[PDB]
Amino acid sequence: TFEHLNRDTLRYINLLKRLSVDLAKQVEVSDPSVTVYEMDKWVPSEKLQGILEQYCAPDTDIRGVDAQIKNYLDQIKMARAKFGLENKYSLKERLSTLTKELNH
Amino acid sequence: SKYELKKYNLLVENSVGYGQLVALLILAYYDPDNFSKVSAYLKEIYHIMGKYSLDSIRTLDVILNVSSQFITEGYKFFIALLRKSDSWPSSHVANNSNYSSLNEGGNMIAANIISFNLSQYNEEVDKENYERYMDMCCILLKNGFVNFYSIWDNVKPEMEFLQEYIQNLETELEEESTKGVENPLAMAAALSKTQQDILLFGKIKLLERLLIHGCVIPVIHVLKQYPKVLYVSESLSRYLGRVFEYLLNPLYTSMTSSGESKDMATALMITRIDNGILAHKPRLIHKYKTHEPFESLELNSSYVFYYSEWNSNLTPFASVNDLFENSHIYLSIIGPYLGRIPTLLSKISRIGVADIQKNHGSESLHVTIDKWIDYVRKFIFPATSLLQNNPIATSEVYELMKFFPFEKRYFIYNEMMTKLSQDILPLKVSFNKAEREAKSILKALSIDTIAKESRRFAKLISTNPL
Amino acid sequence: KLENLKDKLPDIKSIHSKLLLRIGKLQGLYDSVQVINREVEGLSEGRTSLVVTRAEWEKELGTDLVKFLIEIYDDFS
Amino acid sequence: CIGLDFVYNSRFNRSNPASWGNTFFELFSTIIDLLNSPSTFLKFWPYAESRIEWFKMNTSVEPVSLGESNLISYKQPLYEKLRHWNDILAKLENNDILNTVKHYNMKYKLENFLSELLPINEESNFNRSASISALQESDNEWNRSSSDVIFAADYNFVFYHLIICPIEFAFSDLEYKNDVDRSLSPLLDAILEIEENFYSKIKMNNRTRYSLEEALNTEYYANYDVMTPKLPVYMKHSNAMKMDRNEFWANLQNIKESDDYTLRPTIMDISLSNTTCLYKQLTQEDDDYYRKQFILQLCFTTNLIRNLISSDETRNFYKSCYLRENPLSDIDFENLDEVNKKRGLNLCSYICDNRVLKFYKIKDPDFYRVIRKLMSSDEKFTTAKIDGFKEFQNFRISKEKIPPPAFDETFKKFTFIKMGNKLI
């Protein structure tokens, strides 16, 4: 049993830093003043950070958190698609027409 | 059988033993929470060193080697580990920051092992790790682990061989200066290792690194005794200028105010046309840590010096009076070699101009004028006499000089001409080089070659006229 | 002390099992990331959001624009 | 302790002031004998580690300069004390089965004290070429018992015959060498295949992440060269997870350092005895430290064998050492005809250089520097011991009193000649 404990301790501590895998690091900044980005200060959004941190919680189960991740993902896709579809068509048409009228 | 210690102090003697230890050591540097588990690691290492009867000396060495292998970004945990282990001199800790104690205290066994490992530069494998090992020793040599002189007195190049190399360099330089050498252009083109050693390792390299890592008092105390050492290599002057420039920068910004003008160092945003609309984005860079002291930005990423608290022991100036008081220590050491770093000339001269302008109205202006006269006479002008085709620095020094009575300017110029060109070696070398070059150009002035000879003569006369 | 070790086997055992659980969770966490990264790739490579509205897109995007979409598989890169 | 300090303080009053030495040490020995159990010994040692600098002066009544000792192995003070403490060390080593961690801590404290007392150079402070037997890492005859069985047998055979005694496996009859070679080859093959799988997993993860993060931004153009591990973002900035991990490490550490569990094995033992545990240890693909230990062992022993075969100068020293302790031996020490020499110096340069370094020169270029530095340092230490550790005989401890320097803080004066020179 002691041998098992020692080997598993090495496996665990090996698995945090070295064998780790992290996010994709898609970057977008709102502030206009900033022009140079460190590319390492990028953090995930609080909504994602809480959902992730609930994994290593003492009493939580994995399946429910996986479901919550699925729901978050679907919400993100839906909101992004809705905003893009709204922004493209009507805004482009109105901007073009108003620009032409203003030039005339 | 009766009086031997029965311990195994060569790696192949107790293989299993050292195996475990060194493997464990790697673990400590690959552990995210390694910082809060120092005590567990020390207890593990003691348990192991007990089981298979490893030695204390060899095990200290094994720790030092595979630690120096990770020193860059491991130094925090490394120093905490050694700080809590009982191989740390706790009742006689060395100081290394007080002239009266540069040779008292430390852990002399670590001193033996270090002074040993620093003199092995004969094989080919250690020539690529000497840098990291010297950096680890330079880190240890300022937290009081070992006193300085215990390391200085015992590294390879003895003081006598150093002095001999110094005399050889002095004579060769003086001869090549006074006599000079004819550079063959078309001459005869038709008819009808120990120097590298002294320069690259041992005492000189230790001095350069002790200077880079912000420990100025050992090297000040050494160069106070043997000034000629500055002839061995140029890099000492550059690094001393680095620490002095960091010392002076915050005083310099408080005057000649550039802080209000600091808010213009920004980069252009990457602009791109997508779907027929403009879109701006910021540029993305990443940060790397290296052993080279000067920062840079190589086309996508920025490099920085790793040991980011090297400037902990130094306090910048608060008033020009402190600038005088510390000039008398650092600049009197750097000597006539200040010219190797032009930017310092510009900074000090602009500080002078602003200090003289600040009290144009007051009655005591002549006091400050006299004091800056003396300063420029003793510290700056000999330096500017050394420059090489660099007009703007001389333009700055003269922009400061403009405030004096012309009698004083003639005094300084004539003294520099008569008494300080001779009787000082590097100044003499530079004057002789400039003079020979001026005559060489003067022999080749024509109505047809003026288009470029005029520019060259203008640069040469503007840089080092008198 | 070497004779009686049946009485000290439980506690260690406990820790062992506890450690195992921790690893599990951490492993799970990594697996989780390996899905979301993948989904993000989905958004980059062209458009694949061929989702069904079911009166939801009318609620979110707007009833007025819903006409032009009635007459999604839209890019979201 | 108060009496032991009193005898130090009352030295000047004694009739023969030097005679305090043999007195002081004497008392010390007695009390070292009376301590009940290693618990009490560890509770008492910080004293003897506080007042070391009092031991180093054998007879002089004035303190010694820090770093110089005037004790010798055969002098009147140590003549019996070193013999006695070596007896105690030997007895503590002889247990080997019923050793609580307290015992190993005690033996370490003692060996470090004695090694610090005598200088590095004394004739009895560096061993004279005794290659340590009894290196086994088994579970002390507890829990001691397909592919697992053959792997265990092969590892046991090569470990014993090559690493337990490099000397013998250096002077063989050309049957022994080829035997250990035919036993070794597949072992290294399998272990290196496993390490390849390991680094392949790492590189696949990093490459996929980098390709995505590059194709997801405007002008990123990631740097594929660097691969040093870094803590993930969603952990480098959290605080709940860090507190939880610290609570767990504290719980485990409290389990460890408790008087109920002082009979454990070290954190890196391999236990050649229990076959299935050995198999689970070496071939796991997630815990690679055991393979690093094995590679390090092979590299050390092969370094020694190569130097032995080729140098023909250390061979004389080892022959002399083997002879002096036992004038009757059987190893050739001269018979290196060339058919043997060839096979040996070939197997060495094969495993130590052709495979190991060639492997860890492309992948993990930090273990590379580690093994190279350790091998070179071991060679240097061997050749330094050969001459009798004369390189540490000269050290030049400075004894001056350094005064604070004086800085000229005055400026020169100006002559009567207002202008430059008399004429103007």
Author numbering:
A (entry chain C): 106 to 209
B (entry chain A): 165 to 356, 394 to 667
C (entry chain D): 99 to 169, 191 to 196
D (entry chain B): 97 to 241, 250 to 528
Please share excerpts from the published article on this structure.
The yeast THO complex is recruited to active genes and interacts with the RNA-dependent ATPase Sub2 to facilitate the formation of mature export-competent messenger ribonucleoprotein particles and to prevent the co-transcriptional formation of RNA:DNA-hybrid-containing structures. Among them is the transcription-export (TREX) complex, an evolutionary conserved complex containing a multi-protein assembly (transcription-dependent hyperrecombination complex THO), an RNA helicase (Sub2 in yeast/UAP56 in human), and an hnRNP-like protein (Yra1 in yeast/Ref/Aly in human). Yeast Sub2 is a conserved RNA-dependent ATPase of the DEAD-box family, a group of enzymes known to destabilize and unwind RNA duplexes. THO subunits Tho2 and Hpr1 intertwine to form a platform that is bound by Mft1, Thp2, and Tex1.
Focusing on the classification of the entire dataset on the rigid protomer, we improved the density map to 3.4 Å resolution, allowing us to build the atomic model of the pentameric THO protomer de novo. The final model includes the large N-terminal structured regions of the five THO-complex subunits as well as a prominent low-complexity sequence of Hpr1 (residue 501–675). The densities for Sub2 were modeled using the RecA domains from the reported high-resolution crystal structure. In each THO protomer, the proteins Tho2 and Hpr1 together create the platform of the complex. The platform is about 200 Å in length, with an oval ‘head’ and with an extended ‘body’ formed almost exclusively by alpha-helices. The two smallest THO proteins, Mft1 and Thp2, interact to form the ‘arm’ of the complex, a striking 200 Å long coiled-coil structure that is oriented diagonally with respect to the Tho2-Hpr1 platform. Module-3 provides the Tex1-binding platform: the curved surface of the Tex1 β-propeller (blades 4 and 5) binds the concave side of the MIF4G-like fold (at Tho2 HEAT 6 and 7) with conserved interactions. The Sub2-binding platform in the ‘body’ of the complex is formed by module-4 and module-5. In the rigid protomer, the RecA1 domain of Sub2 binds the concave surface of module-5 (Tho2 HEAT 16) and the helical insertion from module-4.
